[PDB]
Structure formats: C-alpha cells, structure tokens
C-alpha cells in the first residue's frame, strides 16, 4: 500500500537512529471541525 524512506537531522553520529520516518504520518489538524468528503469512498465513486 505504502513504502517510504526518510533521513533524520543535523548530527555527528552516523550509527544513531532517528525519527525522520514520522513524516509518513504528517498531516494538518488546524481545520479539523468538519469531515473531509475526499476521505469518504462513496463521494469519490460518485465523482468517478
């Protein structure tokens, strides 16, 4: 379904693991009161 790769940040340690793969869950939650119709499959099928 998904496959991704991510670097981490500024550092001085090549073998230290990091959190750059968190960016696979990146979403915006400012305007989160009402539903996105784009998530609902029914809507998406009607458009097709």
């Amino acid at each position: 379904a998904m496959a991704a790769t991510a670097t981490d940040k500024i550092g001085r340690s090549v073998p230290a693991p990091g959190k750059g793969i968190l960016t696979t869950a990146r979403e915006h939650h400012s305007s989160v009161k009402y539903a996105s119709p784009n998530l609902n499959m029914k809507y998406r099928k009607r458009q097709l």
């Binding site: 496959a3 991704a4 790769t5 073998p15």
Partner: protein, 48 residues
C-alpha cells in the same frame, strides 16, 4: 530492503517496469564481525 521496495514500487508506477525483483542480501565475514565489535554495536558474547 525497504529502500529496495520503495525504488521498486516507484519504478512500477513511473511505468518503467511491470515486474520488479526487490530485496536485500548480506554476508557475515571475519572483518565486519570485528568492526561492528569496535563500534560496540554487537552483543559481546563473554558478558552474555
């Protein structure tokens, strides 16, 4: 291996390949065993 899979997928969606072998492979020898010991990455067997 996960980078392999990513490169693999994006090769299929680009429309460059319909099929793709995808994976990874690595051997254990004397000299890597030693160098991972000097990084203190591997379990010291005498402590164990």
């Amino acid at each position: 291996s996960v980078e392999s899979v990513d490169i693999g997928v994006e090769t299929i969606l680009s429309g460059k390949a319909r099929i793709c072998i995808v994976g990874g492979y690595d051997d254990f020898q004397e000299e890597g065993s030693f160098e991972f010991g000097n990084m203190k990455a591997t379990s010291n067997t005498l402590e164990e």
